Amino acid sequence: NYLFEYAPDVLESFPNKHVNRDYFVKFNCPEFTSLCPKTGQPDFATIYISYIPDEKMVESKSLKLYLFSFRNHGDFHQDCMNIIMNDLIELMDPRYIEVWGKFTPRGGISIDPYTNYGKPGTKYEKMAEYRMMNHDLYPETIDNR
Amino acid sequence: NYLFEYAPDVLESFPNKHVNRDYFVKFNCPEFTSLCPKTGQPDFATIYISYIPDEKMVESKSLKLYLFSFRNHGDFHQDCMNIIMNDLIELMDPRYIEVWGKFTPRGGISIDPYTNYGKPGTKYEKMAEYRMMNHDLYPETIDNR
Amino acid sequence: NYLFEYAPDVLESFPNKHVNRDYFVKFNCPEFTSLCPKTGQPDFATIYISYIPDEKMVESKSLKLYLFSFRNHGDFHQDCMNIIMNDLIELMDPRYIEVWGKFTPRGGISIDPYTNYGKPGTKYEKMAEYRMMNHDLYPETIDNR
Amino acid sequence: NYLFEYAPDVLESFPNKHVNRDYFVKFNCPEFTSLCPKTGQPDFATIYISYIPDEKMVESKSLKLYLFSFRNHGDFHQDCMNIIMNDLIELMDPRYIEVWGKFTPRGGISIDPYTNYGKPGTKYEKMAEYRMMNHDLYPETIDNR
Amino acid sequence: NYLFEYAPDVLESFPNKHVNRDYFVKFNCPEFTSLCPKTGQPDFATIYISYIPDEKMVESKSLKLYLFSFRNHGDFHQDCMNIIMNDLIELMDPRYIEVWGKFTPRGGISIDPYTNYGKPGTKYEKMAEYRMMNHDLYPETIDNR
Amino acid sequence: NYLFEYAPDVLESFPNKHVNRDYFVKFNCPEFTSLCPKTGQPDFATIYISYIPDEKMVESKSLKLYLFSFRNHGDFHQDCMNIIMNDLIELMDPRYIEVWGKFTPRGGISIDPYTNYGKPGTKYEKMAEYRMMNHDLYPETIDNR
Amino acid sequence: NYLFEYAPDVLESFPNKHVNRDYFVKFNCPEFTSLCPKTGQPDFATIYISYIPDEKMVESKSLKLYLFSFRNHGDFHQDCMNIIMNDLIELMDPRYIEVWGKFTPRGGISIDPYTNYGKPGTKYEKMAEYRMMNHDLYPETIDNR
Amino acid sequence: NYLFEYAPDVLESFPNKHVNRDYFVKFNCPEFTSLCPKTGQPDFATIYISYIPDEKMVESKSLKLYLFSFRNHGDFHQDCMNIIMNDLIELMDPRYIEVWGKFTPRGGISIDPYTNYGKPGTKYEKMAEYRMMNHDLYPETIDNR
Amino acid sequence: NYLFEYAPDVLESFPNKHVNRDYFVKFNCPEFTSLCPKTGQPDFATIYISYIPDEKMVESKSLKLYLFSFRNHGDFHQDCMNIIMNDLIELMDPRYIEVWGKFTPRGGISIDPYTNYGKPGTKYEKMAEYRMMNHDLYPETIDNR
Amino acid sequence: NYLFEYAPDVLESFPNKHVNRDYFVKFNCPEFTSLCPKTGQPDFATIYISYIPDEKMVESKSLKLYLFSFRNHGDFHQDCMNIIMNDLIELMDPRYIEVWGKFTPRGGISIDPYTNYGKPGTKYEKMAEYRMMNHDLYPETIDNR
Ligand SMILES: [Mg+2]
Ligand SMILES: [Mg+2]
Ligand SMILES: [Mg+2]
Ligand SMILES: [Mg+2]
Ligand SMILES: [Mg+2]
Ligand SMILES: [Mg+2]
Ligand SMILES: [Mg+2]
Ligand SMILES: [Mg+2]
Ligand SMILES: [Mg+2]
Ligand SMILES: [Mg+2]
Ligand SMILES: [Mg+2]
Ligand SMILES: [Mg+2]
Ligand SMILES: [Mg+2]
Ligand SMILES: [Mg+2]
C-alpha cells in the first residue's frame, strides 16, 4: 500500500506494442524525496529513469505512486537507486535500464549516483558498458544555488 | 474531413536534389499536442524529428498540418511517436530517421520517448544503433519549471 | 509525536541583536512538500520567506523542522502559505513578513501563491501594500521544464 | 461542455478563507492553445493569470478544463485574453486580476497581450494603473529560438 | 513595393473592440534588418514594439510587411526607430507607444535606441515619462556571443 | 553584383601558412537571411560554417559579402546550405567542411539543415562520417521564445 | 593579524576625488567564507557590497584582506553582515552603503541577509528606505543545484 | 592619439534629428580594457553608456576609437568612468548620461562603478537621482566564471 | 586536526553492498578552499569527484571533513587534485576514480586540472584513458562573471 | 618585453611532479586581446589552453604575462593561435596541447580557430586526431549579444 509505506507491488506493466524495435523511454522525476539517508533527515532528488522495454512497459501512474511510496520509508537496507532499478527490472524484464539521481546538497556536497543494466550477452550489455564509460562526461555547473 | 481527424495523408514529399550526399534535416516542433493518453486529457510536447532523405524529402507545410491533425486524435492501437515515424517512413523511405519527444509533466513526471530507424543492413542501421546507444547521454536539468 | 505530524511548536526564536535597524532576512526553501491539496496527492514547491525581525529572529534549524513537519500534514481549515505566515507572526511579531510559493504543475498549471504582512499603521504596512503592488511584476519563463 | 466547445460554465469557485487579507495567486499556464486567430491556424501561448480574491477563489481543476475548452474553439468574437479575464471576473468578483499571454511567433513576430483590472474606486484600481504603467519594463530576450 | 522599398502604405488598422479599458500589446520582432546605417551595409536587431491602443489596433500581418519593407531601404534623413514610431502613431492615434531596438555589434559596439510616446495631456504622457525614466534599469549581459 | 544578387565570385582566398597541421576554423554567422523559401518570404538563420583548410583559406570579409549576397536570392533549384558548402569547396578544396544552419520558425516549426564533406578516401571522410552519425546528438531546447 | 583572525584594522581608505557627484561603487565578492554559524561549520556566500562614498574610498586590496580575515572567525555575538557594513561605516562615513549576502544551503535552506544605511536626515536615508522596501523583489530562482 | 594614447579629441558629434522628444541611446561596450589600475596591470570591462541627447549626438565610430584610446592609458587623478562621462558631457551637452562599468575579478572581487548626470535644474536631474536610487537593485548571480 | 590542518586520517569507508555491478558516484563539492597556491593566499573551486567503487564506498561526512581539512593547508610538495585522488585510492581501492577542479580567476586566468585512474589491467584502465581523451570536449563559457 | 611587445622569453616552466600519469591542465583565458588582425584594429577572445605535461609544466604567472604581451603585437606570417601553441610546445615538450580561440564579431561574424598536437607516434597523437574529429560538435547558440 502506497500511502504510508514502500509499495513495489503498486507497479503495473502493460504490453510493449513495439517489441519489433528499440523504443527508448525516459522519465524525468523531480519530485523525489525519501528517508533513505542513515540520518533520518529526508533527502531530495531529481531522478531520471531511462529504459528500453522488451515484452513490457511500465504504467506511468504506477511509477508515480511507486516513487511516492519512498516518501516516508526509512527501512533503507540496500541502496535506494538500486532498489528502484531492481524493482523495475523485476517488473518489466527490460532490454536496458538506468537510474540517474541528482541530489540536493547536504554538508555542502551533492551526491549524483548512477546505475544501469542491459541484458547479459547482448548489445544492451555493451550499451550499459558504453553509457558507464561515458557517464556524465560533461557536467552541468554546480554552485549550490 | 481534416482539422479534427488524424490525417496521415496530407503529408507530401518532394524530390531530393542532393541524393549523392547525406543531407541532415532537423525539424524542431514545439507546438505539438494530442489526445494520445488513454485518460482523455491532452498532452503537449516539443517533438524533434531528424532525418536523412534518400530520394524523397518531406515538405514542411504538410508536416505542420499532419502534426496539427493529432490535436483531436488520440488512439492507441499504436504509440504516437511510432505512428509519426511510420507514416514518415511510408512517405519517404529515407536513409535514417528519429522522432524524439519531450513532454510536459503529469503527476510530477515527464516522459521523453524516442525511436529511430535506419535502412536494414546499411550504414544507416549502424547509425541508428549508435545514436540509440548515445541517446540523451547528457540530459537536461528538469525541475518542472 | 514529530516527523509525521504538523508541528508549529518546534519553532524557536532568538533575540535580535540589531533591533535598531531593519535587517532583511530571506530563507530560500526548495525542499518543501505537503499533502495540503484536498485530493491527497502531495505537492512540491520552493518557498521563499522574507522578513524583517523586530525583537525576535527565527532560528533556522527549527524552521527546517517546522517545514519538514508539513510532509504528511495536509489540512485545509486554512491555506498552507497562510498557516506558515501565521505561525511565524505568532512566534516573532516581526515588522514585516512575506511567504511566496512556487509550486510544480498539476494538470499543466502551476500555482504561486503569495501573502505578506506588516505591522498595522506603520511603515511596514506601507511596505506590504507596495510589495503586493509590485509583486511578481517580471515573471519567470515557465515552460513546464 | 468542455470537451469540444468553449465552456465558461465549467468554472467553479470556492470561498476565500482569507477575505481578511490580500492573498495573491498566480497561475502559470503553458499548455494554452486555441483557434482564436482569424486564420484558423491554431495559436500557442503561455498564459499567466494572477489575481487577488475577494469573497471567492477559483478551483484550479475547473480552470484547466476551462482553458482546455479553447482548444477547438473558433467562434472568436471578442479578443481571447479578454474573454478569459471577463469570465473569471464574472466568476469571482475579484479585487485584482490580470491575464498575461506570451505567444509563439507567426510571421517572425510574437504577440504578448496584457490586460488587468482592479475594483473601481479602490486601491486595486491604482494597482492596475500602476501594473500597467510598469508592465514588462524589463523584457526577456527573444530570438525566436 | 514593401517587396523592395519603404512602405507605410501597407500598414493597416482595425477597430479595437475592448476600448473601455487599457489593453497592452507587445510585438517581439527579432527578424529586423535594414540599410539604415549610413555605411550602406545592413544592420540587424530585435525590435520590441509595445503600445496601448485607443480606438484602433495595428493589423499584424501588415506590420510584418511594413517591417519587411525596411530590408532594402537606405536611411531616411530621420532615424528608423522614430519613423517606425511616427508611422504607427499616424495609423493608430494610440494612447501609448514605444519602440525599442537591440542591434547586433559593429566595431564591437551594439546600439539600443528607445523612444516612446503618450498622448499629450493624458495619463499616458505621464507613463511615457515614467517608462523613460525607468528604461533599462536592469540591462542584459553583453559578451558579444 | 554584391548588393542585390547571388555573387559567388566575391569569395576569395589566401594561402594557409600551416598546411602541416589541421587548423580548425569556425565562422559563427547570426546575420544570415535570404529569400530561399519556395514561398518568397525571407528566412533567417544563424549559420555555422566549420572547416579544415588544405592550401587555401577564405578571406573573412569576402564570406561576409558572399553571405550578404543571399539577401535578395531565392533560387531553391538547389538547397541553400548545399550551395554555400559547394561554393566554398569550389573556392578552397579543403580537407573538411560543414555547414550547419539554425532557422527561425515558420508555421511553428523551425528547420535545421546540416551537410558536411571530407576529402574522399582520406581520414576526413571518416570525420564527415563520424560527425554526421554524431550530429546534434545533444540538442538545444526549442520553445519558440 | 590578517592570516588567522578578524582584522578590521586592515581596512584602508583613500580620498574620493569626486565628492561632487554620487559615485556608485559595487564590489562582487564570491570567495567569502567564515566560521560565523553558531555550530562552528563554515558558511560560504557571495557577498555584494554596494555604496556611495563621501570623502573616503576603501582601497580594494584591503577589503580583499579584510574579508579573507573572516575565514577563521565565528564571533556571532553580532551578525556577520552587520559587522561588515559597520566596519565599513567606521572606515568611510559614506553617504550610502549596503551589504547583501547569498549563502549556500544548509539543511536544505539557504539564507540571504540584507542590511543598508543612508546618512540620516538626508536623501540617502530615503534611498536606504526605498531600496529596502524594494529589496529582492524579483528573486533569483533557487533549486540547490 | 587613438593608436597609443588617451584621445578625447577623436570624438565627433552630429545633429540630433529629434530635439522635441527624449531619445534614449544605449551603447553596449564589451571590448574595453585599459591600464587605469594603480598597479600598471590592465583591466577589462563591459562599459554601458546611455544618454538622452539635447542637440548633439555622439558619432558611433568616434566612440569606438575614443574607447580604444584607453588601451594603454594609465592614470589621471580621476577614475576612468568619470573621465568618460566628462568627455561625453563636453562633447554633446546631453540631457541625461550614465556610465556603468562591470569589470573582471582581481583578488576574488569584481568592481562595478556607476555614475550619471542630468542637466541641473531639469527633470533629467530628477531622473539621475532616481536612477541612482534604483541602481542595480536586481544584480546577476556572480560566481567568477 | 581537520579543524586546522590536512587530515587523511578522517576519511572513512564502508562495505559496498552492490558490488556485483558498476555503481557510479559523483560528489559535487562547490565549497572547496585551501592555501594550495605557493602564493600563500587561498584558492576557490568546485571540485567534482567521480568514482566507481570496488568493495568499499567513501563515507561522505568523512569526505566533507577531509575536504574541509584543506582550508588552512599551505601546499604539499605535491599538487592538491592528485593528493585528493591518492588518498581516496588508498582508502578505497576503487575500480575508477577522477577528480576535476574548476578554480576561480587569478591574473584573469582560471585553472581546471583533471586526473583520473582505472585499476591497472582492467577495463577501468581503458575507461580512464577514454575519459582522458574525451575530457572537456564541450567546455563551459568563461566571462569571469 | 611584456609591457609593449611580443615576449616568448617571459615563459617559465617548472618540474612536473606527476610524470607517471596523465595530468590534464586547462587554462581559461577571457582577457585576451591583440592587434593580430591584418587591419591594425584589435581583437578580443577567450582563449582556452589545455595540455598534458610530460616533464615540464608552464608557470601560471608567466602565461598571464606572455598572454599580456600580445596586446600591441601585430603580425608575423603565422596565425596567433599557432604562435601560442608553438611557444608552449618549445617551452614544455608537452604530451598533448590545444589552443581554442573564441573571438568577438566583426562584420556580423565571429571566428573560432582551433589547433592541437600530440607527441608524434604516441597515443597523444591519436588523442589529438580524435579531439579534432570530435571538435565543437555541440556549439553554443550564437546571437552576437
Ligand atoms: Mg523476450
Ligand atoms: Mg547553480
Ligand atoms: Mg534508393
Ligand atoms: Mg528551472
Ligand atoms: Mg516592539
Ligand atoms: Mg525551460
Ligand atoms: Mg465583497
Ligand atoms: Mg530565445
Ligand atoms: Mg550571450
Ligand atoms: Mg557553385
Ligand atoms: Mg526558448
Ligand atoms: Mg566595529
Ligand atoms: Mg539552480
Ligand atoms: Mg558567467
JSON list of C-alpha atoms in Angstrom, two decimals, chain F:
[
{"chain": "F", "resi": 1, "resn": "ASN", "atom": "CA", "xyz": [26.95, 42.12, -58.22]},
{"chain": "F", "resi": 2, "resn": "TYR", "atom": "CA", "xyz": [27.39, 42.08, -54.39]},
{"chain": "F", "resi": 3, "resn": "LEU", "atom": "CA", "xyz": [24.44, 44.33, -53.45]},
{"chain": "F", "resi": 4, "resn": "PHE", "atom": "CA", "xyz": [21.19, 42.80, -54.77]},
{"chain": "F", "resi": 5, "resn": "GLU", "atom": "CA", "xyz": [22.10, 39.27, -56.05]},
{"chain": "F", "resi": 6, "resn": "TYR", "atom": "CA", "xyz": [23.99, 35.97, -55.60]},
{"chain": "F", "resi": 7, "resn": "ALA", "atom": "CA", "xyz": [27.68, 36.62, -56.02]},
{"chain": "F", "resi": 8, "resn": "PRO", "atom": "CA", "xyz": [29.90, 33.52, -55.63]},
{"chain": "F", "resi": 9, "resn": "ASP", "atom": "CA", "xyz": [32.68, 35.44, -57.41]},
{"chain": "F", "resi": 10, "resn": "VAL", "atom": "CA", "xyz": [33.02, 37.64, -54.30]},
{"chain": "F", "resi": 11, "resn": "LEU", "atom": "CA", "xyz": [34.65, 34.79, -52.46]},
{"chain": "F", "resi": 12, "resn": "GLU", "atom": "CA", "xyz": [38.41, 34.99, -52.05]},
{"chain": "F", "resi": 13, "resn": "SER", "atom": "CA", "xyz": [41.26, 33.02, -50.59]},
{"chain": "F", "resi": 14, "resn": "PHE", "atom": "CA", "xyz": [44.74, 33.36, -49.23]},
{"chain": "F", "resi": 15, "resn": "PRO", "atom": "CA", "xyz": [47.47, 30.74, -48.64]},
{"chain": "F", "resi": 16, "resn": "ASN", "atom": "CA", "xyz": [47.12, 28.58, -45.49]},
{"chain": "F", "resi": 17, "resn": "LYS", "atom": "CA", "xyz": [50.50, 29.18, -43.86]},
{"chain": "F", "resi": 18, "resn": "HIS", "atom": "CA", "xyz": [50.08, 25.94, -41.89]},
{"chain": "F", "resi": 19, "resn": "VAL", "atom": "CA", "xyz": [49.44, 23.18, -44.44]},
{"chain": "F", "resi": 20, "resn": "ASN", "atom": "CA", "xyz": [51.35, 20.96, -42.00]},
{"chain": "F", "resi": 21, "resn": "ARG", "atom": "CA", "xyz": [48.69, 20.89, -39.29]},
{"chain": "F", "resi": 22, "resn": "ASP", "atom": "CA", "xyz": [44.95, 20.52, -39.17]},
{"chain": "F", "resi": 23, "resn": "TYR", "atom": "CA", "xyz": [43.91, 24.11, -38.40]},
{"chain": "F", "resi": 24, "resn": "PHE", "atom": "CA", "xyz": [40.22, 24.07, -37.48]},
{"chain": "F", "resi": 25, "resn": "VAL", "atom": "CA", "xyz": [38.36, 27.30, -38.25]},
{"chain": "F", "resi": 26, "resn": "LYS", "atom": "CA", "xyz": [34.81, 28.13, -37.33]},
{"chain": "F", "resi": 27, "resn": "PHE", "atom": "CA", "xyz": [32.67, 31.04, -38.53]},
{"chain": "F", "resi": 28, "resn": "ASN", "atom": "CA", "xyz": [29.56, 31.87, -36.48]},
{"chain": "F", "resi": 29, "resn": "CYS", "atom": "CA", "xyz": [27.14, 33.79, -38.73]},
{"chain": "F", "resi": 30, "resn": "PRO", "atom": "CA", "xyz": [23.99, 35.07, -36.96]},
{"chain": "F", "resi": 31, "resn": "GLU", "atom": "CA", "xyz": [23.03, 37.74, -39.52]},
{"chain": "F", "resi": 32, "resn": "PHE", "atom": "CA", "xyz": [22.10, 35.38, -42.30]},
{"chain": "F", "resi": 33, "resn": "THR", "atom": "CA", "xyz": [18.96, 36.00, -44.28]},
{"chain": "F", "resi": 34, "resn": "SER", "atom": "CA", "xyz": [17.68, 35.05, -47.71]},
{"chain": "F", "resi": 35, "resn": "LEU", "atom": "CA", "xyz": [14.68, 34.59, -50.00]},
{"chain": "F", "resi": 36, "resn": "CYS", "atom": "CA", "xyz": [15.38, 30.87, -50.41]},
{"chain": "F", "resi": 37, "resn": "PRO", "atom": "CA", "xyz": [11.97, 29.60, -49.25]},
{"chain": "F", "resi": 38, "resn": "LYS", "atom": "CA", "xyz": [9.76, 28.50, -52.16]},
{"chain": "F", "resi": 39, "resn": "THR", "atom": "CA", "xyz": [7.13, 30.97, -51.00]},
{"chain": "F", "resi": 40, "resn": "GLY", "atom": "CA", "xyz": [9.21, 34.15, -51.39]},
{"chain": "F", "resi": 41, "resn": "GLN", "atom": "CA", "xyz": [9.10, 35.29, -47.72]},
{"chain": "F", "resi": 42, "resn": "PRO", "atom": "CA", "xyz": [12.54, 35.77, -46.14]},
{"chain": "F", "resi": 43, "resn": "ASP", "atom": "CA", "xyz": [14.11, 33.17, -43.93]},
{"chain": "F", "resi": 44, "resn": "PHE", "atom": "CA", "xyz": [16.57, 33.92, -41.15]},
{"chain": "F", "resi": 45, "resn": "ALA", "atom": "CA", "xyz": [19.22, 31.71, -39.55]},
{"chain": "F", "resi": 46, "resn": "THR", "atom": "CA", "xyz": [22.41, 31.51, -37.65]},
{"chain": "F", "resi": 47, "resn": "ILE", "atom": "CA", "xyz": [24.72, 29.65, -39.96]},
{"chain": "F", "resi": 48, "resn": "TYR", "atom": "CA", "xyz": [27.76, 27.88, -38.63]},
{"chain": "F", "resi": 49, "resn": "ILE", "atom": "CA", "xyz": [30.48, 27.08, -41.17]},
{"chain": "F", "resi": 50, "resn": "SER", "atom": "CA", "xyz": [33.32, 24.96, -39.68]},
{"chain": "F", "resi": 51, "resn": "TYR", "atom": "CA", "xyz": [36.18, 23.67, -41.86]},
{"chain": "F", "resi": 52, "resn": "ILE", "atom": "CA", "xyz": [39.85, 22.48, -42.09]},
{"chain": "F", "resi": 53, "resn": "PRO", "atom": "CA", "xyz": [41.77, 24.15, -44.94]},
{"chain": "F", "resi": 54, "resn": "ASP", "atom": "CA", "xyz": [44.28, 22.45, -47.24]},
{"chain": "F", "resi": 55, "resn": "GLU", "atom": "CA", "xyz": [46.30, 25.10, -49.09]},
{"chain": "F", "resi": 56, "resn": "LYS", "atom": "CA", "xyz": [43.69, 27.81, -49.19]},
{"chain": "F", "resi": 57, "resn": "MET", "atom": "CA", "xyz": [41.86, 29.91, -46.60]},
{"chain": "F", "resi": 58, "resn": "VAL", "atom": "CA", "xyz": [38.78, 32.01, -47.27]},
{"chain": "F", "resi": 59, "resn": "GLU", "atom": "CA", "xyz": [39.27, 35.74, -46.51]},
{"chain": "F", "resi": 60, "resn": "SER", "atom": "CA", "xyz": [36.60, 36.55, -43.81]},
{"chain": "F", "resi": 61, "resn": "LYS", "atom": "CA", "xyz": [35.48, 39.89, -45.27]},
{"chain": "F", "resi": 62, "resn": "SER", "atom": "CA", "xyz": [34.50, 38.13, -48.56]},
{"chain": "F", "resi": 63, "resn": "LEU", "atom": "CA", "xyz": [32.49, 35.50, -46.77]},
{"chain": "F", "resi": 64, "resn": "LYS", "atom": "CA", "xyz": [30.59, 38.36, -45.08]},
{"chain": "F", "resi": 65, "resn": "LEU", "atom": "CA", "xyz": [29.87, 39.86, -48.56]},
{"chain": "F", "resi": 66, "resn": "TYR", "atom": "CA", "xyz": [29.13, 36.47, -50.00]},
{"chain": "F", "resi": 67, "resn": "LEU", "atom": "CA", "xyz": [26.50, 35.72, -47.34]},
{"chain": "F", "resi": 68, "resn": "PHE", "atom": "CA", "xyz": [25.16, 39.27, -47.65]},
{"chain": "F", "resi": 69, "resn": "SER", "atom": "CA", "xyz": [24.51, 38.36, -51.30]},
{"chain": "F", "resi": 70, "resn": "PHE", "atom": "CA", "xyz": [21.84, 35.81, -50.30]},
{"chain": "F", "resi": 71, "resn": "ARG", "atom": "CA", "xyz": [19.68, 38.62, -49.03]},
{"chain": "F", "resi": 72, "resn": "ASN", "atom": "CA", "xyz": [17.65, 39.01, -52.19]},
{"chain": "F", "resi": 73, "resn": "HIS", "atom": "CA", "xyz": [18.12, 35.48, -53.58]},
{"chain": "F", "resi": 74, "resn": "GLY", "atom": "CA", "xyz": [15.70, 32.59, -53.80]},
{"chain": "F", "resi": 75, "resn": "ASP", "atom": "CA", "xyz": [16.87, 30.09, -56.39]},
{"chain": "F", "resi": 76, "resn": "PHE", "atom": "CA", "xyz": [15.91, 27.00, -54.40]},
{"chain": "F", "resi": 77, "resn": "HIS", "atom": "CA", "xyz": [16.55, 24.90, -57.56]},
{"chain": "F", "resi": 78, "resn": "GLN", "atom": "CA", "xyz": [19.25, 23.65, -55.23]},
{"chain": "F", "resi": 79, "resn": "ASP", "atom": "CA", "xyz": [19.30, 23.87, -51.42]},
{"chain": "F", "resi": 80, "resn": "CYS", "atom": "CA", "xyz": [20.89, 26.98, -49.89]},
{"chain": "F", "resi": 81, "resn": "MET", "atom": "CA", "xyz": [23.03, 25.27, -47.29]},
{"chain": "F", "resi": 82, "resn": "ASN", "atom": "CA", "xyz": [24.49, 22.98, -50.00]},
{"chain": "F", "resi": 83, "resn": "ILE", "atom": "CA", "xyz": [25.11, 25.91, -52.36]},
{"chain": "F", "resi": 84, "resn": "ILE", "atom": "CA", "xyz": [27.10, 27.52, -49.56]},
{"chain": "F", "resi": 85, "resn": "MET", "atom": "CA", "xyz": [29.17, 24.42, -48.77]},
{"chain": "F", "resi": 86, "resn": "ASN", "atom": "CA", "xyz": [29.74, 23.87, -52.55]},
{"chain": "F", "resi": 87, "resn": "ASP", "atom": "CA", "xyz": [30.92, 27.39, -53.46]},
{"chain": "F", "resi": 88, "resn": "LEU", "atom": "CA", "xyz": [33.30, 27.07, -50.56]},
{"chain": "F", "resi": 89, "resn": "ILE", "atom": "CA", "xyz": [34.54, 23.66, -51.74]},
{"chain": "F", "resi": 90, "resn": "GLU", "atom": "CA", "xyz": [34.97, 25.25, -55.20]},
{"chain": "F", "resi": 91, "resn": "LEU", "atom": "CA", "xyz": [36.93, 28.10, -53.72]},
{"chain": "F", "resi": 92, "resn": "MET", "atom": "CA", "xyz": [39.13, 26.22, -51.27]},
{"chain": "F", "resi": 93, "resn": "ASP", "atom": "CA", "xyz": [39.44, 22.46, -51.88]},
{"chain": "F", "resi": 94, "resn": "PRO", "atom": "CA", "xyz": [39.52, 21.89, -48.13]},
{"chain": "F", "resi": 95, "resn": "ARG", "atom": "CA", "xyz": [40.24, 18.72, -46.22]},
{"chain": "F", "resi": 96, "resn": "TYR", "atom": "CA", "xyz": [36.91, 19.13, -44.33]},
{"chain": "F", "resi": 97, "resn": "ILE", "atom": "CA", "xyz": [33.94, 21.43, -44.22]},
{"chain": "F", "resi": 98, "resn": "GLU", "atom": "CA", "xyz": [30.39, 21.62, -42.78]},
{"chain": "F", "resi": 99, "resn": "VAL", "atom": "CA", "xyz": [27.50, 23.97, -42.89]},
{"chain": "F", "resi": 100, "resn": "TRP", "atom": "CA", "xyz": [25.02, 23.85, -40.03]},
{"chain": "F", "resi": 101, "resn": "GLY", "atom": "CA", "xyz": [22.04, 26.21, -40.19]},
{"chain": "F", "resi": 102, "resn": "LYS", "atom": "CA", "xyz": [19.53, 27.16, -37.46]},
{"chain": "F", "resi": 103, "resn": "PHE", "atom": "CA", "xyz": [16.44, 28.87, -38.86]},
{"chain": "F", "resi": 104, "resn": "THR", "atom": "CA", "xyz": [13.72, 30.80, -37.06]},
{"chain": "F", "resi": 105, "resn": "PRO", "atom": "CA", "xyz": [10.35, 29.13, -37.02]},
{"chain": "F", "resi": 106, "resn": "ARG", "atom": "CA", "xyz": [7.57, 29.27, -39.67]},
{"chain": "F", "resi": 107, "resn": "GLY", "atom": "CA", "xyz": [4.18, 27.64, -39.09]},
{"chain": "F", "resi": 108, "resn": "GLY", "atom": "CA", "xyz": [5.54, 26.93, -35.66]},
{"chain": "F", "resi": 109, "resn": "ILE", "atom": "CA", "xyz": [8.30, 24.70, -36.96]},
{"chain": "F", "resi": 110, "resn": "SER", "atom": "CA", "xyz": [11.91, 25.54, -37.28]},
{"chain": "F", "resi": 111, "resn": "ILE", "atom": "CA", "xyz": [14.23, 23.72, -39.70]},
{"chain": "F", "resi": 112, "resn": "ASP", "atom": "CA", "xyz": [17.95, 23.00, -39.01]},
{"chain": "F", "resi": 113, "resn": "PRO", "atom": "CA", "xyz": [19.74, 21.62, -42.11]},
{"chain": "F", "resi": 114, "resn": "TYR", "atom": "CA", "xyz": [23.24, 20.12, -41.86]},
{"chain": "F", "resi": 115, "resn": "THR", "atom": "CA", "xyz": [25.68, 18.85, -44.57]},
{"chain": "F", "resi": 116, "resn": "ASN", "atom": "CA", "xyz": [29.39, 18.10, -44.49]},
{"chain": "F", "resi": 117, "resn": "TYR", "atom": "CA", "xyz": [32.20, 16.84, -46.70]},
{"chain": "F", "resi": 118, "resn": "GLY", "atom": "CA", "xyz": [35.63, 15.25, -46.00]},
{"chain": "F", "resi": 119, "resn": "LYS", "atom": "CA", "xyz": [38.23, 14.66, -48.84]},
{"chain": "F", "resi": 120, "resn": "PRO", "atom": "CA", "xyz": [37.28, 11.23, -50.26]},
{"chain": "F", "resi": 121, "resn": "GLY", "atom": "CA", "xyz": [39.39, 8.22, -49.36]},
{"chain": "F", "resi": 122, "resn": "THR", "atom": "CA", "xyz": [41.15, 10.12, -46.56]},
{"chain": "F", "resi": 123, "resn": "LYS", "atom": "CA", "xyz": [40.52, 10.33, -42.78]},
{"chain": "F", "resi": 124, "resn": "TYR", "atom": "CA", "xyz": [38.42, 13.49, -43.38]},
{"chain": "F", "resi": 125, "resn": "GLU", "atom": "CA", "xyz": [35.76, 11.38, -44.93]},
{"chain": "F", "resi": 126, "resn": "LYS", "atom": "CA", "xyz": [35.92, 9.27, -41.83]},
{"chain": "F", "resi": 127, "resn": "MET", "atom": "CA", "xyz": [35.41, 12.58, -39.95]},
{"chain": "F", "resi": 128, "resn": "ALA", "atom": "CA", "xyz": [32.48, 13.76, -42.07]},
{"chain": "F", "resi": 129, "resn": "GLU", "atom": "CA", "xyz": [31.01, 10.33, -41.44]},
{"chain": "F", "resi": 130, "resn": "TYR", "atom": "CA", "xyz": [31.51, 10.29, -37.73]},
{"chain": "F", "resi": 131, "resn": "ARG", "atom": "CA", "xyz": [30.32, 13.90, -37.18]},
{"chain": "F", "resi": 132, "resn": "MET", "atom": "CA", "xyz": [27.27, 13.03, -39.25]},
{"chain": "F", "resi": 133, "resn": "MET", "atom": "CA", "xyz": [26.49, 9.96, -37.16]},
{"chain": "F", "resi": 134, "resn": "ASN", "atom": "CA", "xyz": [27.01, 12.14, -34.08]},
{"chain": "F", "resi": 135, "resn": "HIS", "atom": "CA", "xyz": [25.12, 15.13, -35.44]},
{"chain": "F", "resi": 136, "resn": "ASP", "atom": "CA", "xyz": [23.25, 17.22, -32.95]},
{"chain": "F", "resi": 137, "resn": "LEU", "atom": "CA", "xyz": [23.06, 14.37, -30.57]},
{"chain": "F", "resi": 138, "resn": "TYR", "atom": "CA", "xyz": [22.74, 16.78, -27.62]},
{"chain": "F", "resi": 139, "resn": "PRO", "atom": "CA", "xyz": [20.07, 19.15, -28.94]},
{"chain": "F", "resi": 140, "resn": "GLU", "atom": "CA", "xyz": [19.37, 22.74, -27.99]},
{"chain": "F", "resi": 141, "resn": "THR", "atom": "CA", "xyz": [15.98, 23.27, -26.32]},
{"chain": "F", "resi": 142, "resn": "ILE", "atom": "CA", "xyz": [13.38, 24.93, -28.56]},
{"chain": "F", "resi": 143, "resn": "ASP", "atom": "CA", "xyz": [10.19, 26.66, -27.32]},
{"chain": "F", "resi": 144, "resn": "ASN", "atom": "CA", "xyz": [9.83, 29.48, -29.96]},
{"chain": "F", "resi": 145, "resn": "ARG", "atom": "CA", "xyz": [10.56, 32.16, -27.33]}
]
